[PDB]
Design a protein around this nucleic acid. Structure first.
Ligand SMILES: [Mg+2]
Ligand SMILES: [Mg+2]
Ligand SMILES: [Mg+2]
Ligand SMILES: [Mg+2]
Ligand SMILES: [Mg+2]
Ligand SMILES: [Mg+2]
Ligand SMILES: [Mg+2]
Ligand SMILES: [Mg+2]
Ligand SMILES: [Mg+2]
Ligand SMILES: [Mg+2]
Ligand SMILES: [Mg+2]
Lengths: 15, 130, 52, 52, 185, 159, 235
RNA sequence: UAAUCUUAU
RNA sequence: AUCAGGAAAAUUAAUGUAUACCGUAAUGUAGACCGACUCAGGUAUGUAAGUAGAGAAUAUGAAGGUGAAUUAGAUAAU
RNA sequence: AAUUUAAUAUAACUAUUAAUAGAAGGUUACUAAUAAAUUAAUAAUUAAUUUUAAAACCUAAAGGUAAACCUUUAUAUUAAUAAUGUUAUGAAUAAUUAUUAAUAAUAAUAAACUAAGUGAACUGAAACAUCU
């Protein structure tokens, strides 16, 4: 769950 | 010392964790005598010679036949904007293997001549006869 | 006329020239092979002209 | 594992930096493994001992 | 008397096979030559499967002394090898018999007669060998009574024509196959 | 490789929402050659992923598994393709069996004759398609071919 | 790792035994797992089995994108748009307004614009703990009809408020998947029909391809009996 | 000695 | 010399031959096998530098390998 | 709205009673997938009934073997055609490919209960031998 959240956060940061 | 961090005699082995274990476990290619030949299902290809050689039998050799005109535009995945299609075979107990259905399809082909279906024409479509 | 190894070499050369198989193709036609292969990184013992 | 010899050479592309690629970055999984080792193999007063 | 060691025997009930049904996993190579013997084949005095023992199995009982010290003994039947003439087969048939069985044969007036007696008791005290012998005799008697006519050439005449017709269509045809086709017709 | 990359990053990979495996129905109306090509593309993709997946598991010791999931998905599509290929053959065999039963075939021929042939308010095109469909007659020789010729002659006589 | 285990299925029985642990020794199994995992990784909720997993959109009462009020918790009476569900746990990850925990995190997993190792992260939460909203919260939702969605591209059900069925709670329209990948075939080519059932004489796929398609020496496919075979069998 | 039995071809 | 010494599986000519599978590390008079142990035990074969010699005895040791899960001191009685 | 108590789970065995019926393991990989129909009640559905796909190798009994391997050659003949190249004189002889017809094959099978065959001894008799 955490890993997925972190990935989502990274994606958001990118875009 | 065998390993310099272990100065004193713990019950650690020279190699590995345990000497003992289940001896009854299937043989591999590496194990056994010089005469022990396991094999790996790789070569029922040719025939063993009287003298100890081998003679390949090319009619019994695997080729991997690739299409001469490769449709590269077909990809391993489909675009997810396309819905997953669903066929319906109402009035056919056999389903897609129903001979009556096949006959009907043949008849349609004869009449019309390679007309594309609902799903094939319209990408927005999700259910279909054929 | 000529020895076996030499004949084989000649055949291989001919196949290369053709752009056909450089080897005798078998008859057991597998249309839909399921086998995958993993291209490995090269070891020190291999050259740039090798792949494992 | 089957080595092949081929008439043209080939050299792999250079492996990426830790910052560049997400997956090819061995620090995280190795750290996690180390932490697991510490926690399972921690016995008594090494619970108080600070983590590596 | 009784036929306990015979009529106790049970054999696996074979399911009746329809022509359209699926095969069993192990179908035999050569076909069944003889009819099934009701009482199988003896699984104790297997010595007696090879001969006409007349349902006389080996006994086990006790040797008993003056001290009544019991000791296990066995009581074998008076078996004897005997080549006896079959009128039906027109040959003498050599087999192991009990002396009792030989006596019965003599009483009945022949070996064929002994084999073919319709009583169930006889059937029980025939062996599997005895059953086979009976079948051989009975079949022979039937043949003697009733020769086929009281067709093969017609088949032979038609066969080459049939083959030619097949060839004209495109396929080849062999005798054995032709025979198989036109057995029921 | 893929775009000459030692390893596809998370951004370089195709995202899960955008990608779908093939549907069996979709596969069912694709030609044999096309299906074969698709299969080989799938296999190629698996190889690329397999190389990468191995590297990930063996060297870095990851548990990210995107590549593995992709490989699985491709494998699913492949077996679906294999299934449809088998299914088509079976359907053909069933049709052949049906045609072999003579009365049924005769009925089918009669039905064909009634509706589309011998009618008004194209015919040649239908015949040419029908010829290919039912008999071995394109534009070589057999009993079936002969039968088809006879049928064609009969139709001509009728018309 | 240096494993090679992933290219095979070796020690299969042992793996099965390990994988399918008895359920009454599940606490035993997970106690050590919990210990192993760091605080920022581990979750409080029970990792449910794939049998008892909400695969359908009826089984999940809520979809990623819809707005939900939280209750039975610390951040209760809080509206939150649910971001993504977790499949193994059977739970939802809410946005900033939902329930969170502040936990230390290593510099491998640092977001751009962080001073401290301490970071607030969203905890998972069950469908039981949170109720829909439309402002008015919904006590319970029921499904009675179904229809093809244009955006979702599925035959989805109609979310109706429990009791009065005409009050429909509509599904949240998802984000547009702008697909630009080399491994996804486009809509036109993906669906274009290249096959038609035409020939009865010529079989569609060649005879040499059959062995790949099906096993010609299949032990399962039993042969049918004949008259001669019957005669051979029967005495 | 076409009771039985042993051997060889 | 008496102790009297295995078994079993053709040749010319023409036409062929694209050469399958498995073994290959290291250890093996041993810490890597059999002895409950990194056990002075047990464990098959071939080379086994020269100088010396009757020699594979014995001395030395070119090369190679090794100097060790105990050390440092002290060295009473025993 | 929550808490407690008692009962119920795909997720315990044991004994009894009642009712009903007579049933795959392992090995490791080129992983061993499924598709449908009709009926029920108000398009998706759950339920019932029926059809249908694939399914490696080993588990005495195709033939071997040192279980998960090897060898047999059903991606075979044999024939009939069609297309190709060579030999010798339009017809003949061999090889390769592609259709059509013909030819055989896959024992992993319970355990308890029953019936039959053979049939102990310790032990008891305060010994022991009939007897048990
Ligand atoms: Mg070895
Ligand atoms: Mg060799
Ligand atoms: Mg070496
Ligand atoms: Mg040892
Ligand atoms: Mg000892
Ligand atoms: Mg030692
Ligand atoms: Mg010396
Ligand atoms: Mg030296
Ligand atoms: Mg067998
Ligand atoms: Mg006593
Ligand atoms: Mg005494």
């Amino acid at each position: 769950d955490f890993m997925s959240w972190f990935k989502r956060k990274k994606q958001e940061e990118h875009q | 010392l065998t390993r310099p961090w272990k100065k004193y005699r713990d019950g650690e082995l020279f190699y590995g964790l345990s000497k003992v274990g289940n001896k009854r476990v299937p043989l591999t290619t590496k194990q056994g005598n010089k005469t022990m030949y396991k094999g790996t299902r790789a070569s029922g290809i040719g025939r063993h010679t009287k003298f100890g050689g081998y003679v390949i039998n090319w009619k019994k050799v695997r080729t991997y036949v690739t299409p001469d005109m490769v449709n590269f535009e077909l990809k391993p995945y489909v675009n997810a904007n396309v819905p997953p299609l669903k066929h319906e075979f109402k009035g056919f107990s056999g389903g897609p293997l129903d001979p009556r259905l096949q006959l009907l399809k043949i008849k349609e082909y004869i009449v019309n001549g390679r007309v594309q279906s609902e799903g094939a024409t319209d990408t927005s479509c999700y259910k279909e006869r054929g | 006329d000529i020895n076996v190894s030499e004949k084989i070499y000649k055949w291989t050369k001919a196949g290369i020239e053709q752009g056909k198989e450089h080897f005798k193709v078998g008859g057991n036609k597998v249309y839909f092979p399921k086998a995958r292969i993993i291209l490995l990184r090269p070891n020190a013992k291999h050259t740039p002209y090798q792949a494992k | 594992k089957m080595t092949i010899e081929m008439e043209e050479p080939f050299i792999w592309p250079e492996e990426p930096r830790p910052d560049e690629n997400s997956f090819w970055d061995s620090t995280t999984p190795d750290n996690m493994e180390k932490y697991r080792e510490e926690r399972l193999n921690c016995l008594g007063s090494d619970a108080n001992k600070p983590g590596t | 008397r009784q036929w306990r060691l015979i009529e106790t025997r049970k054999i696996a009930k074979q399911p009746n096979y329809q022509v359209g049904d699926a095969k069993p996993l192990h179908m035999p190579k050569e076909r069944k030559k003889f009819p099934d013997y009701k009482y199988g084949e003896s699984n104790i005095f297997k010595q007696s499967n090879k001969g006409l023992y007349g349902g006389s199995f080996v006994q086990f009982g006790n040797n008993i002394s003056e001290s009544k010290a019991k000791t296990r003994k066995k009581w074998l039947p008076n078996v004897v090898k005997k080549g006896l003439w079959s009128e039906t087969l027109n040959r003498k048939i050599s087999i192991k018999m009990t002396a009792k069985v030989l006596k019965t044969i003599s009483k009945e007036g022949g070996i064929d007669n002994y084999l073919t007696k319709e009583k169930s008791a006889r059937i029980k005290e025939l062996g599997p060998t005895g059953w086979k012998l009976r079948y051989r005799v009975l079949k022979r008697k039937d043949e003697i009574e009733n020769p086929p006519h009281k067709r093969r050439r017609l088949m032979s005449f038609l066969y080459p024509l049939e083959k030619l017709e097949y060839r004209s269509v495109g396929k080849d045809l062999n005798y054995k196959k032709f025979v198989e086709l036109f057995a029921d017709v | 490789f893929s775009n000459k990359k030692f390893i596809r990053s998370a951004d370089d990979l195709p995202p899960s929402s955008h990608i779908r495996p093939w549907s069996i129905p979709e596969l069912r109306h694709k030609s044999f050659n096309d299906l074969h090509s698709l299969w080989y593309n799938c296999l190629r993709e698996q190889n690329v992923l397999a190389r990468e997946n191995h590297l990930l598991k063996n060297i870095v010791g990851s548990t990210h598994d995107e590549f593995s999931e992709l490989s699985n998905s491709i494998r699913t599509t492949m077996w679906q393709i294999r299934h449809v290929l088998n299914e088509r053959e079976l359907a053909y065999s069933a049709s052949r069996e049906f045609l072999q039963d003579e009365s049924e075939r005769k009925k089918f021929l009669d039905t064909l004759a009634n509706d589309y042939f011998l009618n008004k308010d194209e015919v040649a095109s239908m015949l040419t398609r029908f010829q290919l469909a039912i008999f071995g007659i394109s534009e070589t020789v057999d009993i079936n071919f002969i039968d088809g010729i006879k049928f064609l002659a009969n139709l001509k006589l009728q018309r | 790792s240096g494993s090679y285990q992933h290219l095979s299925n070796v020690g299969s029985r042992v793996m099965k035994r390990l994988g399918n642990r008895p359920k009454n020794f599940l606490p035993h199994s997970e106690k050590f797992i919990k210990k192993s995992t760091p605080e920022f990784m581990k979750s409080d909720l029970k990792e449910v089995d794939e049998k008892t997993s909400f695969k359908s959109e009826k089984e999940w009462k809520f979809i990623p994108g819809d707005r939900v009020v939280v209750m039975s918790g610390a951040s209760k009476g809080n509206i939150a748009v649910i971001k993504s569900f977790d499949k193994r746990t059977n739970s939802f990850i809410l946005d900033e307004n939902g329930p969170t925990k502040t936990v230390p995190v290593p510099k491998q997993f640092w977001l751009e614009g962080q001073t401290s190792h301490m970071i607030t992260i969203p905890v998972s939460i069950l469908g039981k703990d949170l109720r829909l909203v439309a402002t008015v919260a919904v006590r319970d939702v029921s499904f009675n009809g179904s229809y093809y969605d244009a955006d979702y591209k599925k035959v989805m059900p109609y979310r109706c408020v429990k009791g009065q069925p005409d009050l429909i709670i509509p599904w949240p329209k998802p984000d547009p998947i702008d697909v630009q990948t080399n491994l996804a075939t486009d809509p036109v080519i993906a669906r274009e029909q290249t096959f038609w059932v035409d020939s009865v004489v010529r079989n569609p796929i060649p005879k040499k391809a059959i062995p790949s398609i099906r096993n010609p020496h299949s032990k399962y496919k039993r042969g049918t009996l004949t008259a001669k075979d019957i005669a051979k069998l029967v005495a």
